[PDB]
Amino acid sequence: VAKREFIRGMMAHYRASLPPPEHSVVIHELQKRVLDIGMLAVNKAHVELFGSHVSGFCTPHSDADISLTYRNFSPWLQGMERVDEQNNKRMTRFGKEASAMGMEDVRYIRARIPVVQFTDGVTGIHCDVSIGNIGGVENSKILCAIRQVFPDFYGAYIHLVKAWGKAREVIAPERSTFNSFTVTTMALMVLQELGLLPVFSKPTGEFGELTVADAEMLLQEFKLPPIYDSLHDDDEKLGEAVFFCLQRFAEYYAKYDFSAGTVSLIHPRRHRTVYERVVRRHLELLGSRKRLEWEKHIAEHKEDGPLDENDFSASMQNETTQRPSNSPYVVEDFVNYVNCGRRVQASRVRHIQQEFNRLREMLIDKESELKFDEVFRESDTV
Ligand SMILES: O=c1ccn([C@@H]2O[C@H](COP(=O)(O)OP(=O)(O)OP(=O)(O)O)[C@@H](O)[C@H]2O)c(=O)[nH]1
Ligand SMILES: [Mg+2]
To answer: Do residues 190 and 51 share a domain?
Structure first.
């Protein structure tokens, strides 16, 4: 009876978090507004959505992630001081034109990603605008593709993992733990090990990353178990399947050896030191491409030269720093081998790692004792 009510409520909650019918249009108009601001700021403004609004793993409270690009934008020129400063000047104007258009709480943040955040003056949606977030654009298209296999199954599962994580401070970026995307990736890996998602074992990007095309290819061949086809018109049955995966998810990350293995949708459980060599190869490829592009920019803007090896070295150092193999968690972004879980400090390894021991205790051991509003609520701890 407790289990049956828990599953009922949990699906209820998922069903109440699905974007309303008109929401597609809202988000499209939002994009149009951002592009208007962008056009005032940069030449050949281009605005591209990513994040959960692209993947579809969103609530009506989820923010809007937008990648801004412009004429002669190049991802490889990041690190070069003159291009960096040029981008800062682009984001400065973006900020100023955003306030003028009537965006609220406009904030230009100078960071590991020069970013402009604002609250849309029309719909109240929070917006995170960054220059050339190519990795975000791509891995959001891969996630959307995954969700499409059976939206309510993956959606519900990912929703509840996210609701759980958010509500439980497992996903608390500005609070030193994981972000939505890291947690999504973890939850998706557990489905791979259950045979409920395919293993993206053969990436074919220029730098060895997984591409949208790699992902779509596999997801077209992947079939869920036959029993899954009775779950489309029965929320009690589907909820049972989702609940099963949540138990397996809670379980997995309560017992998973991160001291050896990594989380990866490309190579589940790949050893840290193998990831290390994978990163080294990736960055050797990224590094040389980068060098070629800096050298081309420099040939065309001689006063921006000569190629300053300190600058290059520090740029490469930032790429290396995005990808430690030797950190509390190694959760691999499949599009760039970024260790999107690198930010979780050794001291947090406790919180998370208990609250997983705790999710699985409620879902499995104390199954007969289940209450929706006790598993999924605020946890002021970190
Ligand atoms: O470490 C990261 C963080 C973020 N990202 C990329 O930026 C996107 C937006 O970052 P968000 O924090 O908004 O996550 P999200 O959109 O998946 O989920 P909610 O907002 O609904 O909670 C992520 O979905 C991913 O595309 C990364 O690639 N790596
Ligand atoms: Mg988002």
So the answer is: no
The range of the structural domain enclosing residue 382 comes to 1-18+150-382
* Beta pairing class for 115-119 and 46-50: unpaired
Q: Ligand 2 centre and the CA of 255: distance in Å? A: 29
The helix/strand/coil state of 115 is strand
Tell me how far the alpha carbon of residue 260 lies from the centroid of ligand 2, in angstroms.
30
Domain CATH for 23? 3.30.460.10
Q: How many domains does the chain have?
A: 2
- Last residue of a domain, which of 149, 173, 190? 149
Task: Give the single-character DSSP code of 331.
Answer: B
State the Cα–Cα distance between residues 54 and 128, nearest whole angstrom: 14
Q: Which amino acid is at 112?
A: R
Grouping H, G, I as helix, E, B as strand and the rest as coil, residue 47 is strand
Please tell me the number of the ligand nearest to residue 55's CA.
1
Residues with CB under 6 A from ligand 1: 50-52, 58, 62-63, 65, 135-136, 139-140, 179-182, 184, 333, 340
Clarify whether residues 116 and 145 are in a common domain: yes
Q: First and final CA of the chain: distance in angstroms?
A: 34
Resolution for this PDB entry, in angstroms? 2.3
Ligand 1 atom at shortest distance from the alpha carbon of 173:
12
Residue 306 preceded by cis peptide, ω within 30: yes
